[PDB]
Write an enzyme that holds these catalytic residues in place. Structure first.
Site, PDB file in Angstrom:
ATOM      1  N   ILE A  53      13.287   6.184  24.957  1.00  8.67           N
ATOM      2  CA  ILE A  53      13.732   7.470  25.467  1.00  8.67           C
ATOM      3  C   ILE A  53      15.212   7.715  25.336  1.00  8.67           C
ATOM      4  O   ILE A  53      15.556   8.652  24.894  1.00  8.67           O
ATOM      5  CB  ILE A  53      13.324   7.516  27.213  1.00  8.67           C
ATOM      6  CG1 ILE A  53      13.504   8.743  27.557  1.00  8.67           C
ATOM      7  CG2 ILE A  53      14.190   6.711  27.877  1.00  8.67           C
ATOM      8  CD1 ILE A  53      12.474   9.958  27.149  1.00  8.67           C
ATOM      9  N   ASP A  54      16.064   6.392  25.448  1.00 13.93           N
ATOM     10  CA  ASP A  54      17.424   6.757  25.315  1.00 13.93           C
ATOM     11  C   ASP A  54      18.152   5.504  24.795  1.00 13.93           C
ATOM     12  O   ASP A  54      17.451   4.448  25.056  1.00 13.93           O
ATOM     13  CB  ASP A  54      18.308   7.559  26.164  1.00 13.93           C
ATOM     14  CG  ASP A  54      18.129   7.033  27.694  1.00 13.93           C
ATOM     15  OD1 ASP A  54      17.547   5.890  27.870  1.00 13.93           O
ATOM     16  OD2 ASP A  54      19.118   7.534  28.679  1.00 13.93           O
ATOM     17  N   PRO A  55      19.411   5.146  24.670  1.00 14.79           N
ATOM     18  CA  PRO A  55      20.061   4.198  24.291  1.00 14.79           C
ATOM     19  C   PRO A  55      20.304   3.180  25.409  1.00 14.79           C
ATOM     20  O   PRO A  55      19.809   3.394  26.560  1.00 14.79           O
ATOM     21  CB  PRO A  55      21.493   4.535  23.850  1.00 14.79           C
ATOM     22  CG  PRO A  55      21.417   6.130  23.439  1.00 14.79           C
ATOM     23  CD  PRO A  55      20.339   6.428  24.295  1.00 14.79           C
TER      24      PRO A  55
ATOM     25  N   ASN B 231      15.915   6.765  19.321  1.00 12.47           N
ATOM     26  CA  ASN B 231      16.227   7.050  20.696  1.00 12.47           C
ATOM     27  C   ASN B 231      15.939   8.536  20.856  1.00 12.47           C
ATOM     28  O   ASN B 231      16.585   9.452  20.045  1.00 12.47           O
ATOM     29  CB  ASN B 231      17.620   6.789  21.036  1.00 12.47           C
ATOM     30  CG  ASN B 231      17.734   5.370  21.468  1.00 12.47           C
ATOM     31  OD1 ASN B 231      16.898   4.487  21.976  1.00 12.47           O
ATOM     32  ND2 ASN B 231      18.819   4.849  21.045  1.00 12.47           N
TER      33      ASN B 231
ATOM     34  N   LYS C 158      18.726   7.879  31.183  1.00 18.80           N
ATOM     35  CA  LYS C 158      18.287   9.524  31.080  1.00 18.80           C
ATOM     36  C   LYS C 158      18.998  10.436  31.676  1.00 18.80           C
ATOM     37  O   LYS C 158      18.761  11.742  32.116  1.00 18.80           O
ATOM     38  CB  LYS C 158      16.897   9.572  31.589  1.00 18.80           C
ATOM     39  CG  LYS C 158      15.752   8.522  30.951  1.00 18.80           C
ATOM     40  CD  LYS C 158      14.348   8.948  31.658  1.00 18.80           C
ATOM     41  CE  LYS C 158      14.175   7.881  32.759  1.00 18.80           C
ATOM     42  NZ  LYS C 158      14.659   8.409  34.292  1.00 18.80           N
TER      43      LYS C 158
END
EC number: 3.2.2.27
Lengths: 213, 213
Positions: B68-70, B121, B132
């Site tokens: 979803i993200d780093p 990502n 998030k």
């Protein structure tokens, strides 16, 4: 459990299961806009059959097996159903299931009688004899309904790589059932559905349930 | 093969491979609108690293492994990369690959050094410490870039069922790497990627390539 909505053109009354309720007023609004264009020509299936799959519940479905549209001729409203077991696609699906299960004697196959499976046509009609000829009319209805199905099922199985190019869930895009030189690829795509379900902690499909003896 | 575009805020210059060319002018236009909001806080990764994965080619990629993200801290710009091999996610990914391959001695693991794999990502930054927290800023950039990746890869593998709820290709949505009591489910999800590739007539991933000794 069964509800109904009035529309302005044939079939005039659409019946549907409780589970489809959240999409129906958008569907009515979409169908009223485009119906005249759909009813101009002879269609497969007939207009009174267009929406027959909306009678099927969704909260007990784990798998959607999806084709692009109905058979060019003799569509019943139930995707892949061929009452006299003559349509090439359902025969090829039955063959795959035979090789995956060991069942050899059968007279027919139907995806619509398998617990946890909803067979689906992305477009709900075609002009008689012409595949995908009603793509433009069903467009937004197709998105709406498919979006709603993928909220319930854990695995979406699309049949035909070139067939699907049209607009976040587990998805396999397999070959068309009538595609050639891919018998092994076709057989083991069906097998991976149950694997993906187990890893998702869902019950597998009993694909043999589809057989008609 | 390498191109560059100017933007109005830090990092001021975005470099990218030829393969990303079709999305870049929309990206520039999107990034100019939202950058000030992203640069207000300390981010993982740093601004000069945001777009580092755009240097990677796409025409030789078969699999996207997407988070979803780093990492909330110490992101490098390369998804999942942890230089000192301390981040829980990449350690758990390495464990799965160890059990799938039989390789037991290793000092690290990197998804970005495996032929045919692009680690990704969905959101390209987060506010330092908060997962998030930059979802709203990356929104349209995230759609644009993911859409473009799925034109090249044959299998999209998303990690985290609840993580992905945000908007037609083969896709598995697996558990987060750090999720508990699902070791078997995690291991065999990685294994199904290569199966799906073979059935798509693509070459499998040599996941052991990821190991650092």
């Amino acid at each position: 459990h069964m509800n109904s909505v009035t529309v302005s053109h044939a079939p005039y009354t659409i019946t549907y299961h409780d589970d489809w309720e959240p999409v129906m007023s958008q569907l009515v609004e979409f169908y009223n806009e485009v119906a005249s264009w759909l009813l101009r020509d002879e269609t497969s299936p007939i207009p009174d059959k267009f929406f027959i799959q909306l009678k099927q519940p969704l909260r007990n479905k784990r798998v959607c097996v999806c084709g692009i549209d109905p058979y060019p001729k003799d569509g019943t409203g139930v995707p892949f159903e061929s009452p006299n077991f003559t349509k090439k696609s359902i025969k090829e699906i039955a063959s795959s299931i035979s090789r995956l299960t060991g069942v050899i004697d059968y007279k027919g196959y139907n995806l619509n009688i398998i617990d946890g499976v909803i067979p689906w046509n992305y477009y709900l009609s075609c002009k008689l004899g012409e595949t995908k000829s009603h793509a433009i009319y069903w467009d937004k209805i197709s998105k709406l309904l498919l979006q709603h199905i993928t909220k319930h099922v854990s695995v979406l199985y699309c049949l035909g790589k070139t067939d699907f190019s049209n607009i976040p869930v587990t998805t396999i895009v397999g070959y068309h059932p009538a595609a050639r030189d891919v018998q092994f690829e076709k057989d083991r795509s069906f097998e991976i559905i149950n694997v993906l379900l187990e890893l998702d902690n869902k019950a597998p499909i009993n694909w043999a349930q589809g057989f008609i003896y």
